[PDB]
Design a binder for this molecule. Structure first.
Ligand SMILES: O=c1ccc2ccccc2[nH]1
Ligand SMILES: [Ca+2]
Ligand code: NA
Length: 306
């Protein structure tokens, strides 16, 4: 276990480059940041609002889930995200950053007639379609439902694929891309959505209240999920809040293991390095990017690793 960088303002959305550098977002600093393996840092772009998740796109640009902004309040020695005051929330969107110029473009701020609320994380399929989660926003006495969306290849249009769940956070594709996984934050449940084809959830039979997917795993106790990354084996590695670990879930739902990280606010994971057997993990409470040896290889991401 190795600490690569410190003094990051709530790191998230790690994208591990082939050379082992990491481009990540700092939600509280509202920026996209390049982190080199020795700890030296460079700001790539200012991204006002709440840049929350990142993924390299087929056009070579860095696509960003912008949750619109958080309130920030001190808790357990860390500045934690909270419900934003109206003046702290500028609207959720999907954005794109030219890494060489720092230019930021806003691509979508609605799906149909409904504004996007709190876009969180995202993953590309091999065709260039873009899956992403919406965590929703919190307000003083209520909160938005979760959702998942798909933007068709070429960034032509956005469609609603999952709606009405609790806040959704991590999202990933199986190796064969026939299954999309969404992590539900407050319940610590990983939901598996069968796809009839690229970008299209195949609705499953309801279990209790309008479920479109299968809850293949739900952790016990007081454990919540954040973002995730998939292994070439098909296992889903989910950053686990409160207990502070990576939860490795097999495609069948089995809890393979839990890898402690030392931070109750462990938020994301991404694979890179030789054989993609290195796990790069954002400890957002401590403000750190860490590296860890992984026993199995990561799933190469489209347009970054393959
Ligand atoms: O992606 C996110 C977004 C919000 C958030 C808040 C508290 C802890 C982890 C979080 N991860
Ligand atoms: Ca997240
Ligand atoms: Na990730």
């Amino acid at each position: 276990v190795r600490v690569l960088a410190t003094d990051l303002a709530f790191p998230e959305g790690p994208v591990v480059m082939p050379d082992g550098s990491v481009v990540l977002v700092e939600i509280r600093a509202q920026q996209l940041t390049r982190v080199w393996p020795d700890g030296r840092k460079e700001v790539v772009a200012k991204v006002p609002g709440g840049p929350n998740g990142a993924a390299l796109g087929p056009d070579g640009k860095m696509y960003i889930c912008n949750n619109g902004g958080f309130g920030w309040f001190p808790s357990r020695g860390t500045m934690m995200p909270g419900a934003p005051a109206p003046h702290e929330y500028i609207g959720g969107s999907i954005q794109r950053v030219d890494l060489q110029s720092g230019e930021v473009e806003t691509l979508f701020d609605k799906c149909g007639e409904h504004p996007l609320k709190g876009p969180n994380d995202l993953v590309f399929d091999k065709h260039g379609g873009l899956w992403f989660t919406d965590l929703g926003k919190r307000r003083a006495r209520d909160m938005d439902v979760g959702a998942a969306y798909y933007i068709k290849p070429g960034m032509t249009e956005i469609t609603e694929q999952v709606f009405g769940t609790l806040p959704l956070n991590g999202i990933g594709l199986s190796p064969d891309e026939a299954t999309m996984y969404a992590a539900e934050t407050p319940t610590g449940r990983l939901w598996a959505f069968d796809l009839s084809g690229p970008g299209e959830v195949k609705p499953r039979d309801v279990i209790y209240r309008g479920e479109k997917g299968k809850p293949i795993c739900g952790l016990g106790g007081y454990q919540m999920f954040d973002s995730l990354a998939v292994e070439a084996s098909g296992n889903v590695c989910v950053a686990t809040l409160v207990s502070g670990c990576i939860s490795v879930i097999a495609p069948d739902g089995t809890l393979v293991e839990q890898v402690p990280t030392g931070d109750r606010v462990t938020t994301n994971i991404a694979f890179g390095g030789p054989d993609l057997k290195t796990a790069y993990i954002t400890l957002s409470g401590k403000g750190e990017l860490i590296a860890m040896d992984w026993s199995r290889p990561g799933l190469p991401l489209n347009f970054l690793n393959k």
